[PDB]
Design a protein around this ligand. Sequence first.
Ligand code: DCP
Length: 129
Amino acid sequence: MTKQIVVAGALISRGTLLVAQRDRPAELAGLWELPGGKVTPGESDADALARELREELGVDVAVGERLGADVALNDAMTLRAYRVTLRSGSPHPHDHRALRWVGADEIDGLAWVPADRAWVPDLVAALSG
Ligand SMILES: Nc1ccn([C@H]2C[C@H](O)[C@@H](COP(=O)(O)OP(=O)(O)OP(=O)(O)O)O2)c(=O)n1
């Protein structure tokens, strides 16, 4: 449906999900997301996501299966989540205001960025198996 894709990672470790608090732009700063970024020319979804998580968080991940449905952000961009597994590193907020590990009991009530909120059921399911 669009020409531009934004990939995001659902990193689950020890039964909790990594969420990242945006610091920009103003309209999203303070709200929580699955970290990731735009797929750039030449990149696969996995290349782009692993690169974004290395840049933003300082971690190495393996990119797994899609999580949940694609989301239309606007007329130009589609947002897609993938499950990812931590291979090496501890996440650090290089670009984000804060990081947090959340369990199933926290997913629904988190101050999500609006687009990511459609993934709530999928994230809760992922944390429960
Ligand atoms: N889990 C996420 C990740 C991103 N987005 C939205 C926010 C932006 O509208 C768009 C692009 O996200 P980026 O984090 O890549 O924003 P940038 O604009 O910083 O990308 P770049 O600066 O590389 O152009 O996707 C979102 O709704 N949910």
